Symmetry: D2
Subunit: 317 residues, 4 copies
């Protein structure tokens, strides 16, 4: 009859006898994304009246709206060294986010994004200090994650999220400023001949991965196409809709990869898994890895299940 907005979708997804905290958290996130997108679309130009980096603005916006929701006890921005504990205005959700992913693409104004992961406090635990929070993040796994999403700020703005019952994607309609459901129940194809990785680091890769990449180029069965925007959110978003593989492997300088576990990889892993893909690191599922440090890094091999299997076959043989 009329198309479904993100606002409707969030409210209609609320199970009976919920507090409404999670719903208010999603509303806060949605509003952040709009504010952040508006500043990005302006490329940070001042208004014509009155004749601030976009990282800084995005981070300020995301924090402000999440702290105003009363649903969080802990915030973690990838940029900042410490977590923020909400005063005690304190729910039981921990949010970890990267507010402006693909920061090297900002000056060219190509695709960039935001990523977030939401965890709930384990039962019979509470956080009054950073030292409590440090203890708590160490006992969390990606499989205990209640929600994940990203926003891609591209030629259009897309918001893609999951609560553990599949993945739904929404496109911002700028006439009325609402996110409209355009990609329901996203299902990443089981195979697709596209790969996404920075081959500038070829010389520093492990031999098994070098062999993998050479096979993609030299094999006689299947021609592969290469794409690498340089923003994880941009590349993953293409990977979800088109199929393929996204890789950021180990290298001589980055022994545990580049991407952060809490802030980027675990959230994206949940989305990719919920869309029917695989999402692995050094040893199986990213969602099963233990958090030891807050800023822990991990390699990633995310995408179409058969494309990730091929990749791991090179590592296993």
């Amino acid at each position: 009859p009329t198309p479904t907005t993100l606002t409707q979708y969030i409210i209609k997804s609320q199970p009976p006898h919920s507090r409404g905290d999670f719903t208010l958290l999603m509303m806060a996130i949605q509003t952040s994304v709009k504010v952040i997108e508006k500043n990005i679309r302006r490329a940070g130009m001042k208004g014509m009246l009155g004749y601030a980096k976009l990282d800084v603005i995005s981070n300020i916006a995301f924090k402000a709206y999440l702290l105003s929701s009363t649903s969080v006890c802990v915030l973690g921005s990838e940029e900042e060294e410490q977590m923020i504990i909400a005063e005690s205005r304190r729910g039981d959700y921990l949010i970890f986010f990267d507010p402006l992913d693909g920061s090297s693409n900002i000056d060219a104004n190509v695709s960039v994004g935001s990523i977030w992961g939401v965890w709930r406090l384990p039962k019979d635990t509470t956080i009054n200090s950073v030292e409590d929070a440090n203890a708590v993040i160490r006992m969390l796994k990606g499989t205990d994650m209640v929600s994940a999403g990203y926003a891609v700020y591209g030629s259009a703005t897309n918001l893609v999220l999951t609560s553990g019952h599949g993945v739904d994607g929404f496109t911002l309609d700028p006439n009325i400023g609402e996110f409209i459901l355009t990609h329901p129940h996203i299902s990443i194809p089981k195979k697709r001949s596209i790969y996404s990785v920075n081959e500038g680091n070829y010389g520093k890769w492990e031999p098994w991965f070098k062999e993998y990449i050479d096979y993609l180029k030299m094999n006689k069965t299947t021609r592969y196409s290469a794409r690498y925007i340089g923003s994880m959110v941009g590349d993953i978003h293409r990977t979800l809709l088109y199929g393929g593989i996204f890789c950021y492997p180990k290298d001589a300088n980055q022994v545990e990869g580049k991407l952060r576990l809490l802030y980027e990889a675990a959230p994206m892993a949940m989305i990719v898994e919920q869309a029917g893909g695989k999402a692995v690191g050094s040893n199986g599922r990213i969602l099963e890895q233990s958090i030891t440090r807050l800023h822990q890094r991990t390699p990633v091999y995310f995408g179409s299940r058969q494309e990730v299997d091929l990749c791991m076959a090179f590592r296993d043989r």
Copy 2:
């Protein structure tokens, strides 16, 4: 005092004793870009009215043609998508030929990542006129990229940027969506002489010429300089990054694409003019793209565009084999 709009810039760039036709052509192009950008930002969603009761390629092409044909300044239009040129009806006929790709990076449309529009403007050679496609075919064959009066692109990314040149450098403008004006944000764009970024589809490695394979391996394996790779998959996106950051963009020959992929009139020549005007090099199979002769309308060419020293390194591998 106040920032310069594209509209001001175009009018203030008009040389004394011009007809004003070129100015009206730029205004028409500017308006097209705004209309196209708006449909792209909506990802082609119908209005909420339309849902109770069209590909982006098709819409972009319709928009670009309509505004250019309304300007009274063109005699010939060429859209990359279409097989033939369109001759304007006489009565509404200037002496400009426009060749354009209205939606570059069409494989990126469904993901809604960066895409673009590209155009090149030529003037009729003195003592010539076009009444038919056969006249137009004769005329394009006597044109070179060095006779081009104007070139530009629009990048539809996280912001919308319009970058253009009239032969006196390159200026870039960012769309301010509050007031719908293009504001001068990148005056006199100067592409760095070197930068360690390269842009090419390495999925085609196996089908490349050995000299280019060696080039790419050197970028990866050499011990002096670490290179970063970027390839969005839209020429306008990749070139725009190349102009502001420096680096190199390559679409070389391969076994299946013997003369490369990118069209000479519609894409490569216009981009070559922009890159050259910003201080970079822009070469094909044998020197400057702007010096190549148009034989066919849909003629292809390889491209090696970017920072001068990065394009020199690339050609050094071809010259030493």
Copy 3:
């Protein structure tokens, strides 16, 4: 920390152990208002694509409002002022809310593109009653009063877009921020001043008014104590919105041709009365509070005297002393 959006406000207002139907109804209304506002701001111009390939705003507004309300699953009955009959929602998609609305108030101001609006009132089904037909609905509206109304609101499409609503705990006003397309709380707990020297009525109908009202209007002009200013936009939503924020009085009285006034009870007057009362003003008709009047017909008319409590008292003093 950050300013409150309408979306937050609606969710945070949800009492514990509600079904969430009312919340979904407000979201549907909010979305309608944005869609309607966008078409109004364009003055109904086709897109630049629509022009090369080559709908009244009343029709579009009505289509939008109905579509979003019927998609919410919370209504059983819709009533648009324009249409002769009520619409009963198909069972399967049927809550227990009745919405009566005027989707584009001030229709004579459309061509000039000055202030126009939308108005709605929300009622709940009386306990142990249900509607399967227009004949059931007709029975049910007759047993409703304005005092049984669970919610009322309007949207003003002016130089800015404002949405003003109440659920029986005061009146809050929100301004559309067009950058991000959210309604932001700008006028919390609206309190209409007890007096203000502004009056709003169509004096083109002076000759057809009752003598007591003629005397009232002459007093406003001729008295020696207090100079009054006149304002009449011609859209009830525009005039009432000014009245709420500035104070004053809005009148549409009886006349020779309009014996029971012009404005409809269910669609316009009762919803506005609830808002005005919740903001501290008075809102009366032929005989006391509009909210106490009985609905006899669906399209029943009533005179209105809405506004600042002391300005409405002065007005009624002229009627009571004759």
Copy 4:
């Protein structure tokens, strides 16, 4: 083929062998109007960024209008209605155009966010004259008449944004398309109807009017031939804009407290008179055409009787027969 933008219209209207200064002035005005409209649509809310880190609309509008006009290099003299003095442009950046404007007309309607506007009139320096000081400018405005005016326009910030202008060859109206931020020609060659039964005036001042005008207003109400409708938004730009498209009359007459009326001659009345006259209406003051009156003071007031030619004739008939 495609619809005409204001930008196209301005350039195509440029006569052969013009300097282009006037064209640049119109572009500057157009851009001002968009900037002003955007701040008005936000009701002056700070951005959501501005709120975490923690300006009247009259002040912002005035700053915007001045900045864009001073950046055009085409003006020597600016006059904002709000300010007491004229601004002389610094020499080096000095054309021969004098602009007089009211950047935010209808200031009493700002808080309610109903219709408001901007008005401007453009004059050219008389041949063999120049301005180096306010004292030169004062001499020059005294020798100007409304008939020497090269251009006039207004912007109405209503439910949509309309820009209406004239260069002495009729009146054309443009509606802002907010998708692409361009003014699109929607009302070409505006022709105000010769008669229409609508009148616009503040009847709150009835008691202080001259007897002839009281008789006029009573005739509109009491006569047996023609029923009149009353409309008064309270913003001259809003009321006039309705008058141009619908027909009728707008009046701000003399009163006991305002012996020469309220509206300023240079800033409001003369510009509107030019527009109304160019659309086929009449626009008179105390003694014939407003455009023929002599400027004695900068802030000189005048009564106005603007609108449909037969409606203004009826009005003046009451003054001529007493």
